[PDB]
Nucleic acid binder design. Structure first.
Ligand code: MG
Ligand code: MG
Ligand code: MG
Ligand code: MG
Ligand code: MG
Ligand code: MG
Ligand code: MG
Ligand code: MG
Ligand code: MG
Ligand code: MG
Ligand code: MG
Ligand code: MG
Ligand code: MG
Ligand code: MG
Ligand code: MG
Ligand code: MG
Ligand code: MG
Ligand code: MG
Ligand code: MG
Ligand code: MG
Ligand code: MG
Ligand code: MG
Ligand code: MG
Ligand code: MG
Ligand code: MG
Ligand code: MG
Ligand code: MG
Ligand code: MG
Ligand code: MG
Ligand code: MG
Ligand code: MG
Ligand code: MG
Ligand code: MG
Ligand code: MG
Ligand code: MG
Ligand code: MG
Ligand code: MG
Ligand code: MG
Ligand code: MG
Ligand code: MG
Ligand code: MG
Ligand code: MG
Ligand code: MG
Ligand code: MG
Ligand code: MG
Ligand code: MG
Ligand code: MG
Ligand code: MG
Ligand code: MG
Ligand code: MG
Ligand code: MG
Ligand code: MG
Ligand code: MG
Ligand code: MG
Ligand code: MG
Ligand code: MG
Ligand code: MG
Ligand code: MG
Lengths: 271, 93, 46
RNA sequence: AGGACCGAACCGACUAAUGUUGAAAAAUUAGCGGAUGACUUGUGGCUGGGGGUGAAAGGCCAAUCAAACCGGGAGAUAGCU
RNA sequence: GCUCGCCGGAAGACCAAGGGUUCCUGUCCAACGUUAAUCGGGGCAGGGUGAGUCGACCCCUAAGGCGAGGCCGAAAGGCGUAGUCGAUGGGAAACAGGUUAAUAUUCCUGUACUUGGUGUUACUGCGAAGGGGGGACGGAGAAGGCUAUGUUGGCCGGGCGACGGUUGUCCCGGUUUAAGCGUGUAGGCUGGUUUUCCAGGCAAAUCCGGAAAAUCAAGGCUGAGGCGUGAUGACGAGGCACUACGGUGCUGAAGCAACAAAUGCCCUGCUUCCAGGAAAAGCCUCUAAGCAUCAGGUAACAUCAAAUCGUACCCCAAACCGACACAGGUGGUCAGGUAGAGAAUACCAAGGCGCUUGAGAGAACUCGGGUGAAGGAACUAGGCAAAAUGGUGCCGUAACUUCGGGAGAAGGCACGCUGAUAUGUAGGUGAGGUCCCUCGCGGAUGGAGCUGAAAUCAGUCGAAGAUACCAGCUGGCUGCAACUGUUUAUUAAAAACACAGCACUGUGCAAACACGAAAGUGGACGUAUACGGUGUGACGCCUGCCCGGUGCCGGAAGGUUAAUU
């Protein structure tokens, strides 16, 4: 459902929108809602620590079940919903014992579908199982890193993880980045891909669209004075230097990962 | 039961003026100078017991003292409390 | 035009008031200095 | 429907004249731009000086800014007047 | 006092902030007021601010602040849990009339309403730091139903006109009424009820959520306005009598309808879109520990209480911010008439002002404007400035184009008044009357009365009918930037910055990175369709060769190489 706006105005000419008629047009499930006020990139010292954040639409936080630890009880998908906090869509599910929860909506999951989590659940999209119980070569999403901690990998719209091999108490996984990573075989994964894969086909069309999402403008370092960026200065457009961050670190190709604690779980880097 | 001493403290002076006199003739109200911390109940009880009169309601306001000048020197008069207390058409204090 | 001083009692009290001075040792040093000088008015509170 | 169009409030500040010991330490008059938006505005809050903030002009941070203001080192030093 | 002029979406009225006696009265004119001053926001003295219902206080929380223990840090301190504060937001209740020199929803008169404590009666399962419900929420858009309000008619009171006419199809004025209570209407939402069960709501729940039955077919909640009452009252033009000439007192007619109509109400509604739209308490409901012929709750009545603080006055300003009685700045509400699309604009109403030096004269020159023979950009760096265009309806409109635009392209025609169409039309509103029923704020019909565009034909006046105020100059070639935005507060608004888009690069989550000696925090309650950095800058067609130098990435055979030994 990718549709382009007619050029009735200069700010509409290039707009491409993704609209899902399958989504709920009403209000979200109130008992699973929380407030999340905005930070503007400021930390508890009040200083800007991440640039280019501010403004944007008010959002309510939807408590989403990333653990899926309620094993044994089946559930039905009531509807699909828009989530402002993330790219992917979320689904409201009703457990047969009378409990309602939000889950990430995987690709192909519509109203009426049944889901189940546990060691003894069927291998079908939406169901969560320990990767010890999932056939090798399965497309999964919402992958746990530590058992019982909740899904942390492949959560954005359209993403998944490939279960490449299983030897010992460990499974080899291929991540969206191309990295090959070993994780413990007791970590749960949900079958299938994350839905809303057309999310990347959108074209914002105008500056105001980026402002609505809370992104503030980026000023090129080469356009400022030398006192406040390494790239600054010159009479006319001049560069004559190797590109760096505002803090002087070379910013085209220099590697920054330094974590010896988790080096043992990486099979190959994304390259 | 507000004590005898407090009742004897809370009344200071009648308020003499044209508006007070008119309140007396028209609405059967006496206007009093009372203590700054004196409450409506204390004023009512003191008026009833020392004036030997029956009271139905007490209205209170605080007067802000005036800033005047005594020979190039700044000087301010004190705040005070004034009470509009109504008598019930039978006592005529 | 819009000048620099836009009065507000609440903001003045919170920024320069007695409680605000007493809340940090530097503010208490301000009070100590102003008492040692002999100021008739220590703060903006009054 | 629209960072859509004309146009008041409102926000601004392109031209000209006046004023330049001003009515005003930045305005007035006639025109001028935006005017449902990246809009505007009230109240309160947070970020502190080699620091902040900056759709970036070295702009702004109380008529002060290529390093605020106040006090102190302090009677800095001055082959200069 | 009588004339004149000005504002009237304010130059009127009222809140908030800010100020603090500037408010009212008597007295005085030294100093202050850009002059005089008998006057004043000046001096001096007195007076003036009345609340259960307005606000604060109070209960509840947002951002944020503080923070027992705690974690961290040479010290000073930093951060933060349980908590506790913090409105700009949520939470009970009052209206109309009258009165002062100065207060009034506070005082008086009349009519109301809220909350709680005590006593009793009757009935009875009550009980929270806990569960559930609710409070509770966006932008835009569209009707429909109303009201504030206005106009006209009717009614009542008065008038008969300084100069031709004016007993009428004439002139002037008035024609007002609340909260509350009763009614539950236009409309909005939702299918109800009694059963039986259950991996859920941290345990319990009879409450909420889920599963199934049978029955019923209309129940429930919400809601402007209207009407009745409130009100045989109050108010009321005017009239009679004084007046200390400021004003005081008594009396008191009509007090109806039709039509028009909001940006206000129903509406926290409905339709729709994506950027997906606070919290907590009050409130309702459910049980646990536990009390249980007591407590405790429900309903009816009686009684008591609702403290304290603010309340004057200015508030687009001479009282606030600007050193000034300073052409500046200052958030919200109110919103009449004619014309008009209009909160533009012109003249007016209510109301408020003539801006704290005047009097003459009628030179140059300066400032702000009007008009101009013939010419018409010859001016000048440059058409700077000025002049000009300017409305509605209809007709018509090119290259180019991303097919939306270009476009109001260009250019043209009509425009006042009167009569007829039509004693006022198309349309709108709509009383009676009749008919019907689950009876009412009900439906069908009926159309009196009221209101009422635009068009046509014919005449008619002027030089001129969008006559004033108001209100696009237009076209042709070209550089730059795609565009809307932003910027050097106070000589630069631009071709500069940003931008949607593109690319390189880093980053596997205790992410990279940033702020922090640290604890922590942001990134992000995000997870590579993500986040940071860098350069370029919509879109179209595209983006060639060089890795010698410098940087970055990968490799470790050999050489050199620190502390150490
Ligand atoms: Mg960024
Ligand atoms: Mg960018
Ligand atoms: Mg520059
Ligand atoms: Mg540098
Ligand atoms: Mg150059
Ligand atoms: Mg070069
Ligand atoms: Mg009273
Ligand atoms: Mg009071
Ligand atoms: Mg626009
Ligand atoms: Mg425009
Ligand atoms: Mg500006
Ligand atoms: Mg102007
Ligand atoms: Mg405009
Ligand atoms: Mg400055
Ligand atoms: Mg320096
Ligand atoms: Mg020294
Ligand atoms: Mg010296
Ligand atoms: Mg020398
Ligand atoms: Mg006028
Ligand atoms: Mg005075
Ligand atoms: Mg006065
Ligand atoms: Mg004088
Ligand atoms: Mg005076
Ligand atoms: Mg401690
Ligand atoms: Mg703290
Ligand atoms: Mg807190
Ligand atoms: Mg509190
Ligand atoms: Mg408040
Ligand atoms: Mg008054
Ligand atoms: Mg009406
Ligand atoms: Mg409007
Ligand atoms: Mg008042
Ligand atoms: Mg000044
Ligand atoms: Mg003056
Ligand atoms: Mg002024
Ligand atoms: Mg303003
Ligand atoms: Mg006007
Ligand atoms: Mg002259
Ligand atoms: Mg002239
Ligand atoms: Mg002229
Ligand atoms: Mg002439
Ligand atoms: Mg001529
Ligand atoms: Mg001529
Ligand atoms: Mg000519
Ligand atoms: Mg020429
Ligand atoms: Mg020439
Ligand atoms: Mg020449
Ligand atoms: Mg010009
Ligand atoms: Mg002109
Ligand atoms: Mg005609
Ligand atoms: Mg050229
Ligand atoms: Mg541009
Ligand atoms: Mg522009
Ligand atoms: Mg400038
Ligand atoms: Mg400029
Ligand atoms: Mg972290
Ligand atoms: Mg560029
Ligand atoms: Mg370019």
């Amino acid at each position: 459902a990718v549709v382009k706006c007619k050029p009735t105005s200069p700010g509409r000419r290039h707009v491409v929108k993704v609209v899902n008629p399958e989504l709920h047009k009403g209000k979200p499930f109130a008992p699973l809602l929380e407030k999340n006020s905005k930070s503007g990139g400021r930390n508890n010292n009040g200083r800007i620590t991440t640039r280019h954040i501010g403004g944007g639409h008010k959002q309510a936080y939807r408590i989403v079940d990333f653990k899926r630890n309620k094993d044994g009880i089946p559930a039905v998908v009531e509807r699909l919903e828009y989530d402002p906090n993330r790219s992917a869509n979320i689904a409201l599910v009703l457990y047969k014992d009378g409990e309602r929860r939000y889950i990430l909506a995987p690709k192909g999951l519509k109203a009426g579908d049944q889901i189940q989590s546990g060691v003894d659940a069927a291998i079908k999209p939406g169901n969560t199982l320990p990767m010890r119980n999932i056939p090798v070569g399965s497309t999964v999403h919402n992958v746990e890193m530590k058992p019982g901690k909740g899904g942390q990998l492949a959560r954005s719209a359209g993403t998944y993880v490939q279960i490449v091999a299983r030897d010992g108490a460990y499974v080899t996984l291929r991540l969206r980045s191309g990295e090959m990573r070993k994780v413990e075989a007791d970590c749960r994964a949900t079958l299938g891909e994350v839905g809303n894969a057309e999310h990347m086909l959108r074209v914002l069309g105008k500056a105001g669209a980026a402002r609505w999402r809370g992104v503030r403008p980026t000023v090129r370092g080469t356009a400022m004075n030398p006192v406040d960026h390494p790239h600054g200065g010159g009479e006319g457009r001049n560069f004559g230097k190797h590109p760096v961050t505002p803090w002087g670190v070379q910013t085209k190709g220099k590697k920054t990962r330094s974590n010896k604690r988790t080096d043992k779980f990486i099979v190959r880097r994304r390259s | 039961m507000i004590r005898e001493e407090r009742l004897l403290k809370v009344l200071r002076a009648p308020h003499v003026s044209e508006k007070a006199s008119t309140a007396m003739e028209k609405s059967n109200t006496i206007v009093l100078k009372v203590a700054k911390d004196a409450t409506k109940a204390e004023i009512k009880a003191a008026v009833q017991k020392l004036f030997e009169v029956e009271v139905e309601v007490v209205n209170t306001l605080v007067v802000k003292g005036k800033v005047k000048r005594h020979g190039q020197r700044i000087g301010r008069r004190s705040d005070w409390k004034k009470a509009y207390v109504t008598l019930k058409e039978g006592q005529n204090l | 035009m819009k000048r620099t001083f836009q009065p507000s009692v609440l903001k003045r009290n919170r920024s320069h008031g007695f409680r605000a001075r007493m809340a940090t040792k530097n503010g208490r040093q301000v009070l100590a200095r102003r008492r040692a000088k002999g100021r008739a008015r220590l703060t903006v509170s009054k």
